[PDB]
Structures are given as C-alpha cells and as structure tokens.
Amino acid sequence: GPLGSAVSLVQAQTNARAIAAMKNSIQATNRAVFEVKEGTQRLAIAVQAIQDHINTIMNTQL
C-alpha cells in the first residue's frame, strides 16, 4: 500500500549508493592487480639479469 512504493524507492536509492561504492572498489582492486603485475615484472627482470650473469661471468669464467 503506497508504502511498498516508498520502500522500493528507498531500496533503489540505497542500491545506487552501494553501486557507486562498488565501482570504486573494483577500480581499487584493478590497481592492486596492476601492482602485483608490475612487481612480478620487476622480479622477472631481476631474474633475467641473474640468468645473464650465470651464463656469462660464470660461463666464460670456466
């Protein structure tokens, strides 16, 4: 009874707020994922340098 309308209207306004926040959440999560990627990338670069060393200064050195 005209209250149900008021109830959905409020739920609707709540959901809209919930959504906007969720959007910010997902964006922050994507940034975290990007950060882990960069970190693994850096580690990979470090690993690639340790590899070159092993097959050079440790290769010809023998």
């Binding site: 739920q11 709540t14 959901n15 707020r17 919930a18 926040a21 969720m22 910010n24 959440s25 997902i26 922050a28 999560t29 940034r31 975290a32 994922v33 950060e35 882990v36 960069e38 970190g39 693994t40 850096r42 580690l43 670069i45 470090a46 340098a49 340790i50 060393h53």
Partner: protein
C-alpha cells in the same frame, strides 16, 4: 655493480607489492559503503 642493481630491482618489487596491499585495503574500505 650487478649486486646493487639487482638489490634495487628487488626493492622495486617489494614497493609494488606493498602498493598492492594498499589498494586491496582501499578496495575493502569502499566495500564498507556497500550496505543494501
């Protein structure tokens, strides 16, 4: 020196990972506003 540079590279790694934790924190902080 290779030692220093690799050490620097590893520090970059650690900073990135800490940045990840920072964003995960922000992500969960935002979900605290998800109350429907």
């Amino acid at each position: 020196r290779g030692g220093i540079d690799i050490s620097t590279e590893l520090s970059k790694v650690n900073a990135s990972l800490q940045n990840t934790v920072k964003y995960i924190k922000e992500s969960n902080h935002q979900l605290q506003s998800v109350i429907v």
